[PDB]
Design a binder for these strands. Sequence first.
RNA 1: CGGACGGCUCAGUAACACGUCGGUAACCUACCCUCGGGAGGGGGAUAACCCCGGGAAACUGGGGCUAAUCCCCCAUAGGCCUGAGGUACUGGAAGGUCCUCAGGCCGAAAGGGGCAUGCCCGCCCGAGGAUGGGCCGGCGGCCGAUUAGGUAGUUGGUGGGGUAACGGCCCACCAAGCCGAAGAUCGGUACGGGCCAUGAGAGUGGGAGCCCGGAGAUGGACACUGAGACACGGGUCCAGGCCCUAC
Lengths: 108, 242, 123, 95
Amino acid sequence: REIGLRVQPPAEVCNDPKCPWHGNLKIHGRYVEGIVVSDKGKKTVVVERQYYHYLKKYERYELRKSKVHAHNPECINAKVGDKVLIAETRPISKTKSWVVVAVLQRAE
Amino acid sequence: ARKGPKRHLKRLAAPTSWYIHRKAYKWAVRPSPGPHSMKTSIPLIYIVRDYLGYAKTAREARKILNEGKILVDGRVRKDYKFPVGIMDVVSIPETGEHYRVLPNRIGKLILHPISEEEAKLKPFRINNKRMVKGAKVQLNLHDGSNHLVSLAEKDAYKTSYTVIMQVPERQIVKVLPFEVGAYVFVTQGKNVARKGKIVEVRQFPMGWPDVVTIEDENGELFDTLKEYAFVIGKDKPEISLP
Amino acid sequence: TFKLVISNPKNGVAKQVEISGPEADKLIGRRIGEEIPASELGLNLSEIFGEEIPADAKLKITGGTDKDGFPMRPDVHGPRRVKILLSRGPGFRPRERGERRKKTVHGNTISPNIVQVNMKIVF
Amino acid sequence: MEIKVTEIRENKLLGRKEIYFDVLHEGEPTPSREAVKGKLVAMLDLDPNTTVIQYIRSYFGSNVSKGYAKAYETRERMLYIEPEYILVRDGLVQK
RNA sequence: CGGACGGCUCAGUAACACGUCGGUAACCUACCCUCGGGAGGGGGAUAACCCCGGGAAACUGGGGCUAAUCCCCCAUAGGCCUGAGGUACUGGAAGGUCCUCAGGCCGAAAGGGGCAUGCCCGCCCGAGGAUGGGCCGGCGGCCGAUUAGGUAGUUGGUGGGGUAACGGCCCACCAAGCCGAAGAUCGGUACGGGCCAUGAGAGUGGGAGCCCGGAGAUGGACACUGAGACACGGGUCCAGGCCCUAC
Ligand SMILES: [Zn+2]
């Protein structure tokens, strides 16, 4: 099915039921962007994103980082250095409740 | 640690849509489940005792209710916990009185007096649609009620139209659609109790609800959610509003 | 020494008598549910009941109660007191739904610590 | 003491008239219930029975008190609706 | 039918416990509302009551007799699983709903009570709502380096079991992954917030009394019944105390 986002689907065809493309898994809630930091686990990726936090008393900001564990289907084989799109879903494992939906810029 | 459901309500924890003194006593009447939500309704005891003033004590109010004197949507209601909500009619024949329940520009519920002829109609907004066994169509309305229609006339109903009905027998009249020149009355939000004509609808991705633009009766535009827009006419309201 | 409560079903009456000596010790090792010819205890059933009752009128044991007040339970074996968790009777009257209590009861077999025995006139 | 009726309502459900009135007593104490009731009925043509006086209330310095009264049609409806304590207080029933 | 609310306390807890924004297309819900449908045929036991009692008490045995909106059986409707098709509904998107066919498991109901010559209060099934909960996520929120490496079902995957439900929640097999000087782990102290005191303010400190939420009922563990409890004035065992006794 063509899901409720606006991204191009992958040129592959998986058969795993845990995929939002070609499967029965369904995405709902938030969707963000990030970069891949690790791709060593089987069908697993770690994603980081940066943001600035304002400190009132001193009137200045500090940079903070957020790590998120996501599922990586076979039709979308994301590797380190990629800028990726992830979406919230039901819990898949102990640490994973997000899924990769599209790669936006491969690495070199 | 609570081991089950609640059966009590404190006055300081009551909803803002009510007209109630909060620092006078400690307890309030906890509404029973029913047609409307808790944030958009109020029990009958308060309408009989604190709004209209036909009684000073809950014993008197309960006697009045159990004697079979108050009607809602054309039906006798004896439960003092029964919730009354938006677009409902409260009628008293021993005084020929008829009221429609509506919100203010603050979000509080008032009684607008109407006539005995308009007191026989109630508009219902369609909230959802289903197929039921036998291939019948079930419309799920805004007060929580349901209505059956046939498969042959399923395209004549959608999930934001309005249906006017004779309330005690519940027969359909004067379907009103959601279009770009329809008249609407807002029920919730910051622009509550305003009215106007539709101009534009906007859709969004991944769960975010749709939005609607409305033109005031004098030229001013505003926006709100499509679920908070209640169609009441095509170019002229079909009920007496304040 | 034993106190017998002998009950006639066809009427609905019951009589209380006492028994001593061999007429008493003929009852040991007898389990609930056994029959005993009344002749072996030295009792004229017709004379005590005051309506004549025919021969071979063998009695049956139903239950009893001990010197400390605890009753017998046919499901437990032996003359020994036990303490068990009960959901039904005999030996427990539940005052609530799903209630269980730890009650002490006597077993099937009869013993000298027993006082009251109950008998049903059988035909 | 003089009386001045300020407002009247009809309750068709409970079957009563609800009367709000003022009582002017300058130089005198607060009047009793007997006198107020006598005057009320003598004036408004109400049955001395089927008429109960709620609070008579004095204020800090006014020489003007306020009063609330209920006038019923039948006595059975009266005894059914009203509690026994105001009836004993007015004297239409015994303790 | 209810007693699982209300009422009391702040020991434990540095945690999705709390606050705010969102999700459940991964779930349960007696009392209430609306709509669509049903109530056919049989049987049984037993308290109260009568005849005997036992026991210091707490409590409790036998026989006889009996009714129900008590209990059971048959039927029909209905619920659940799987397979093959059709594509009628909602939605942003169907492991969802609807139609057809097939093979199987479970399996309803009180036509009762009252008034009267039909009305009121009630019973069972289905679709939805409401009320109350369960679960998940993003963000935010004390001090210590004279606490530096920690984790071994630990991190993931395939297949299953169990649950109301997703899930290493648990199991069999295949891999070596996960956190960390931007301070992990360990320790100390502590119920959290709305709020409160003070100060011109920036800020510093506290968070018993009212409201929302959490936890607990001498310490610890484990179960029955029920829509809902592992139950503050119900149950079982151990530890630590006490009371009556004809021992
Ligand atoms: Zn795929």
